[PDB]
Ligand binder design. Structure first.
Ligand SMILES: CN(CC[C@H](N)CC(=O)N[C@H]1C=C[C@H](n2ccc(N)nc2=O)O[C@@H]1C(=O)O)C(=N)N
Ligand SMILES: [Mg+2]
Ligand SMILES: [Mg+2]
Ligand SMILES: [Mg+2]
Ligand SMILES: [Mg+2]
Ligand SMILES: [Mg+2]
Ligand SMILES: [Mg+2]
Ligand SMILES: [Mg+2]
Ligand SMILES: [Mg+2]
Ligand SMILES: [Mg+2]
Ligand SMILES: [Mg+2]
Ligand SMILES: [Mg+2]
Ligand SMILES: [Mg+2]
Ligand SMILES: [Mg+2]
Ligand SMILES: [Mg+2]
Ligand SMILES: [Mg+2]
Ligand SMILES: [Mg+2]
Ligand SMILES: [Mg+2]
Ligand SMILES: [Mg+2]
Ligand SMILES: [Mg+2]
Ligand SMILES: [Mg+2]
Ligand SMILES: [Mg+2]
Ligand SMILES: [Mg+2]
Ligand SMILES: [Mg+2]
Ligand SMILES: [Mg+2]
Ligand SMILES: [Mg+2]
Ligand SMILES: [Mg+2]
Ligand SMILES: [Mg+2]
Ligand SMILES: [Mg+2]
Ligand SMILES: [Mg+2]
Ligand SMILES: [Mg+2]
Ligand SMILES: [Mg+2]
Ligand SMILES: [Mg+2]
Ligand SMILES: [Mg+2]
Ligand SMILES: [Mg+2]
Ligand SMILES: [Mg+2]
Ligand SMILES: [Mg+2]
Ligand SMILES: [Mg+2]
Ligand SMILES: [Mg+2]
Ligand SMILES: [Mg+2]
Ligand SMILES: [Mg+2]
Ligand SMILES: [Mg+2]
Ligand SMILES: [Mg+2]
Ligand SMILES: [Mg+2]
Ligand SMILES: [Mg+2]
Ligand SMILES: [Mg+2]
Ligand SMILES: [Mg+2]
Ligand SMILES: [Mg+2]
Ligand SMILES: [Mg+2]
Ligand SMILES: [Mg+2]
Ligand SMILES: [Zn+2]
Lengths: 104, 159, 85
RNA sequence: GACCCGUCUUGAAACACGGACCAAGGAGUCUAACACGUGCGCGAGUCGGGGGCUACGAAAGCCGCCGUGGCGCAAUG
RNA sequence: GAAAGACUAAUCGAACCAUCUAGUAGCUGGUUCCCUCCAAAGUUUCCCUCAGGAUAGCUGGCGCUCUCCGCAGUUUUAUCCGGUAAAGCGAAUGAUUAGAGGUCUUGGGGCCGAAACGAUCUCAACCUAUUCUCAAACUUUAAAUGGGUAAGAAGCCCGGCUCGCUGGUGUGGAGCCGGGCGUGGAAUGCGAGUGCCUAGUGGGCCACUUUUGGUAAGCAGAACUGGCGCU
RNA sequence: CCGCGGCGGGUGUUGACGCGAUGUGAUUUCUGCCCAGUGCUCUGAAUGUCAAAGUGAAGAAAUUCAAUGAAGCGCGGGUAAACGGCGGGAGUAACUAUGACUCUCUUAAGGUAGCCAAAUGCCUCGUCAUCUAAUUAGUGACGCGCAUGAAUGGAUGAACG
RNA sequence: GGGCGGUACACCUGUCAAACGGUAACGCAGGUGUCCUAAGGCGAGCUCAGGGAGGACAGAAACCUCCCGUGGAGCAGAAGGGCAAAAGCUCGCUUGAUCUUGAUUUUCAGUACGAAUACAGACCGUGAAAGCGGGGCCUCACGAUCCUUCUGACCUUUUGGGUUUUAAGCAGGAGGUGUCAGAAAAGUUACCACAGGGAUAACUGGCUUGUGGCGGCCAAGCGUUCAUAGCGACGUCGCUUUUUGAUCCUUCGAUGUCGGCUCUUCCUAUCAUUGUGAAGCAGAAUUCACCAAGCGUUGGAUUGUUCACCCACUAAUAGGGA
RNA sequence: GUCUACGGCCAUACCACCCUGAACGCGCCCGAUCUCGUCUGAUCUCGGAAGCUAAGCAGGGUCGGGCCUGGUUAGUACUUGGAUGGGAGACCGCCUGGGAAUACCGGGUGCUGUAGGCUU
RNA sequence: GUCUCCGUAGUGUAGGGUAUCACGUUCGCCUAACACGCGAAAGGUCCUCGGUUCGAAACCGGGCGGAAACACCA
RNA sequence: GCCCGGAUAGCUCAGCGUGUAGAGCAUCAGACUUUUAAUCUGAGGGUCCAGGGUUCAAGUCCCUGUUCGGGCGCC
């Protein structure tokens, strides 16, 4: 697929429709002081070894895609997420096709 | 193990009748539908929005809701032994009136006409529908000639 | 090592040992599933009915007298017949 | 007229299995909790189970400024 | 162990004796007195589920509110729905046989030809009217059985009120306070209604017709009713 | 090499003609080519990855981020009497013509000396000669060997069972 | 039967389905785990495949022009259904593929996820307009707790009070479990052990007879000539259980499992002998058929052999069951 | 009999060839300053009015195709229920009741429920 | 036990708009003749019928032929 | 997911931010009285794909299409 960089849409805090700025999303790093990590290391240590399961039978080969819509008017500066259907190939804002040219 | 799709086995059912394709005629829409009327359901393949599921094609129920382009409706269904009373929301194309109630609404009026009249006359006019009785003894006149003697045909190989 | 799969052999009777119940029908059927624009205006009209009782009261208290003045302005053989007398 | 009884089994007289013969012994019990029916007392209240006081009796009878406490009378986030 | 998994108190591909111990089992066998009343299932969804359990179903028990209007594995009268058996190619979608008239619509060869649709025998396809047979995944038509609804008081008919929705016009509807109208508005038969707790079962079999695979089977697999299992 | 343990114990009252750990199997006779693979070992700042500790900075601090970074794996040499491996592209003459000499080369080299239808060869009772009146077995030979072969040992030969 | 081999283990499209609906098998013919800022959402304007008649190089087929032209074209993919001043083709303007409570349908326990339809409260796109639009014309294209990550509000809690860091909180998307209502998992045992099963194989026996074996009808030809002395093409009707298959009914708290030696009996579809017919039967030899199973049907080399093959004798060296 | 906007399944209303068309009407026709568009004033848009019956127009015609209804095909094909009814089997008869479709032969070719201006 | 290739001048054999090599073999070239070497011949139902095609042998099956394969586990 | 290096004429293959090298095939000639071997020209280059910034890119950065190392693992 191919999406443009600026979409005009709703905003919660402002009330109206406003133009945005589009970029995609990457995960954050796992922090080490979070509760399921202060529990997993505290339970993991000592003898006994592996306790919680480990996933190995990975089947599918694709991710859902999530957009990160940021506002533009410099007083709001709010952000919200967005979801799109599955795809393998992906980009943002470049070289939109046309109608009727010479196909080799 | 057959499939469980939305439109299984509806090749001939949602199809248009022969030489009746094309545009939906404009006296289907501008008829009026109140609440309480009795309605039969016939599917249609042109306007795909708001179709009924294939297990209602022929049933008949009454209205409880009217919407901007649709009416709600209460029907009955039989699932594995019992009977459920379920309600849908159907667009106008897939819907007609039923004329089943009308010969009753023509016989309530005819009876009350046959009752207001001739009650003050002290007359006793029959009101109940009575089934077709056994027919009366009657004469048959054969003026002149005799009945025509039949003969069973002798066989020959037609082919 | 096989096994039968699907059947429907005794179920057209196994249903009729306790009857096929028509759905319990009943007057004053509910209002769940109606559009809120119609149901709002019916609710405010069910909330301001006690505003116009007197003209309704006297206009029902006039036909009781027009009817009481209108109703006031309106008001086999012979041997067998003997033996059944 | 009439195949030998118990047993799994769609299907036992079976070329399916256990059984030579008699007497005694032998297999859904015991607590805790909860749910519903049912019988009894008191009733917006109820309960002394733990504690005290006066041969059968290791029983019974009392205590209310010993009713603290339990469940109930008021739910929701 | 000069080797075979040999021997180690008649015991060895991990000895013997006691304890935790009465170890676990969806798996085999057995399960102790009489009569009376009611009486089944081997199907559904989900499960590392297919010898098993949960769930709905069928069944029994205890009662309850009414009767001492209501319902029905049925029929009639009105009404809509369906694409099966039959049939049909002179009708579409596909398959297919043989002649008949035409101009060539084009060719491979005769053929006279320095050329032709000039003439050609034509085999041939091409166009028009005709003809022989076919169809689960093709259809113009289109039965039999069969599937829902309706058969009056929860209806009709007269006043009037409220509305913040709809609106040219109290228009358009809906909801409300009131009054009036019973020959009970097809036939036949019958007392009905709801509310709890819950055992057993989920290995199924045969025939009439209808029907798929298979050369056929006392074979395998489905639909309608009925039986043995339970006699 | 043992062992729960210590300045513990055996080998060891021993010292390379000695302890310990392996594969082959007398003598005679020969022991072929391949270090890409899996192992093994050696040069390692010739360096890509690499914990704890100790160091620096920003912060009120808990913290967070950076430099540096041992062995070993990686990269580079050695080794087959270490496990183990040893196929293919169709004809090249001057008469049959199997076939000279090759053709031909792709993924580490591509079955040499020698032996056979054997205790190893499916087709199979292979074909030839002999042994018998008649021999799916025996003995001798041919090799194209489903799937023979060199210390996972090949061919040998008196005595003995 | 297991195994090797497959996916009927989640979905959709036609068919089986017996004219509502529902409905099975390792039953058929087929496909999917995606693709697209336009191939989504509005509006104007046009009409396709094929066919004819013509036209410079131009031909079977380039482009132009005229007429017929109910879909014979196209709509991203499988197939049905659906479409003509459009749902197609060509241009214009945009981001309703956005934000938020519920109700209902779909398979179904009438539970979920998934998908979808009607409404309602906001902001926008559009077309003068009426209105159409909250994702692909419809029928498939996807996912639980627990944990993690991100955003959201001048949010509540961070525990003797108060302030700032951190963590825990409530709401919405994402990080995936294809055995698809969701465990984290490679082999062998011929040294083998226990719990059970005829629900499930290896023998026999049963029902069946395609394959094997045996016998008929019809009559184009062969037979120096002459269809049927003996034979029989393309075709067609049956029996037999001595071959192999198919199935799985009975036995797995055991019916002792290949061959041969020895030993009785039985069947006839007759190799020889007894009595009789036809020949392309002169005699001698030989082939063909009828009544007929009382009596016979051998000795040996090689192989574990049933089977085969070869040397002799003979009247003949026929075939099988229990 | 005509114009405007329609209704119903939209064919009794379609298609092909002919013909007559009074008056009001509809239309081809005359043209390109007026920000309507095109390569092109043909189409679309505008300003018009000398001149005339081909026109999806209107009406009738064809021993017309087509369609719409009726007989024949036919109590045939098929079929719900049943029988110790045949038959080696394939399949066929009976009682009970329901009951089609082509070919072939006949008749019809727009009603206008419709509101406004109009043969008046 | 039956599935996988492929069939073409006399031999054997290369490959959607013609039937091609090499050898087999007739005549001709250099030479002193000789050998080697060279150039022009004949040779074709590209297995037998029907469809895709403007034109198919190379595309499609049905079919007859040959060869090389396979059947495992009591 | 972390970091890391690798792709150039028909085969192997050089490239030093200011230019497309090379060796081996295929042609044509020259050298030898004639064959062999060696000698030389010529024909072939999109530097694996888009961008950047620089006067100038094959070259540093950036990502996407292709091969590979290594250490790691809670849905
Ligand atoms: C596995 N074996 C075979 C011996 C087994 N332990 C016992 C045995 O007889 N097993 C064999 C017996 C039956 C089994 N078999 C054979 C054919 C068949 N159609 N189905 C079977 O189940 O095949 C087995 C087989 O040998 O592998 C060996 N290690 N040799
Ligand atoms: Mg540790
Ligand atoms: Mg079952
Ligand atoms: Mg007797
Ligand atoms: Mg038992
Ligand atoms: Mg059991
Ligand atoms: Mg059994
Ligand atoms: Mg039973
Ligand atoms: Mg018994
Ligand atoms: Mg037993
Ligand atoms: Mg016994
Ligand atoms: Mg006793
Ligand atoms: Mg109680
Ligand atoms: Mg010893
Ligand atoms: Mg051993
Ligand atoms: Mg042990
Ligand atoms: Mg016990
Ligand atoms: Mg025990
Ligand atoms: Mg009872
Ligand atoms: Mg599970
Ligand atoms: Mg089990
Ligand atoms: Mg159970
Ligand atoms: Mg048919
Ligand atoms: Mg069975
Ligand atoms: Mg059966
Ligand atoms: Mg009985
Ligand atoms: Mg019963
Ligand atoms: Mg050694
Ligand atoms: Mg090596
Ligand atoms: Mg050799
Ligand atoms: Mg020998
Ligand atoms: Mg070897
Ligand atoms: Mg050696
Ligand atoms: Mg049905
Ligand atoms: Mg599309
Ligand atoms: Mg349009
Ligand atoms: Mg809205
Ligand atoms: Mg062994
Ligand atoms: Mg052994
Ligand atoms: Mg059995
Ligand atoms: Mg037998
Ligand atoms: Mg046979
Ligand atoms: Mg003759
Ligand atoms: Mg036994
Ligand atoms: Mg025994
Ligand atoms: Mg005989
Ligand atoms: Mg008129
Ligand atoms: Mg006049
Ligand atoms: Mg006509
Ligand atoms: Mg030269
Ligand atoms: Zn924003």
């Amino acid at each position: 697929v191919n999406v443009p960089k600026t979409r005009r849409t709703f905003c919660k805090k402002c009330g109206k429709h406003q133009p945005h700025k589009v970029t995609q999303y990457k995960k954050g790093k796992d922090s080490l002081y979070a509760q399921g990590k202060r529990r997993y290391d505290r339970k993991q240590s000592g003898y006994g070894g592996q306790t919680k399961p480990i996933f190995r039978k990975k089947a599918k080969t694709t991710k859902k895609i999530v957009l990160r819509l940021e506002c533009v008017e410099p007083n709001c500066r709010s952000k919200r997420m967005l979801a799109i259907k599955r795809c393998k190939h992906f980009e943002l804002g470049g070289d939109k096709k046309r109608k009727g040219q010479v196909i080799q | 193990t057959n499939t469980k799709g939305k439109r299984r086995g509806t090749r001939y059912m949602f199809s248009r009748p022969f030489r009746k394709h094309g545009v939906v005629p404009l006296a289907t829409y501008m008829r009026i539908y109140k609440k309480g009327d009795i309605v039969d359901i016939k599917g249609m393949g042109t306007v795909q929005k708001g179709m009924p599921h294939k297990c209602y094609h022929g049933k008949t129920g009454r209205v409880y809701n009217v919407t901007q382009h649709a009416v709600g409706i209460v029907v009955n269904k039989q699932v594995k032994g019992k009977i459920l009373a379920k309600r849908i929301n159907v667009r106008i194309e897939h819907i007609k009136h039923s004329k089943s109630r009308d010969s009753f609404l023509k016989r309530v009026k005819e009876n009350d006409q046959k009752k207001k009249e001739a009650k003050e006359k002290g007359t006793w006019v029959q009101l109940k529908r009575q089934p077709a009785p056994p027919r009366e003894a009657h004469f048959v006149r054969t003026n002149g000639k005799e009945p025509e003697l039949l003969e069973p045909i002798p066989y020959e190989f037609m082919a | 090592a096989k096994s039968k799969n699907h059947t429907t052999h005794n179920q057209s009777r196994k249903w009729h040992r306790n009857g096929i119940k028509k759905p319990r029908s009943q007057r004053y059927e509910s209002l769940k599933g109606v559009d809120p624009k119609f149901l709002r205006n019916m609710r405010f009209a069910k909330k301001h009915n006690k505003k116009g009782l007197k003209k309704m009261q006297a206009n029902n208290a006039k036909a009781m007298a027009a009817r009481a003045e209108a109703i006031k302005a309106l008001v086999v053989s012979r041997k067998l017949h003997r033996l059944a007398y």
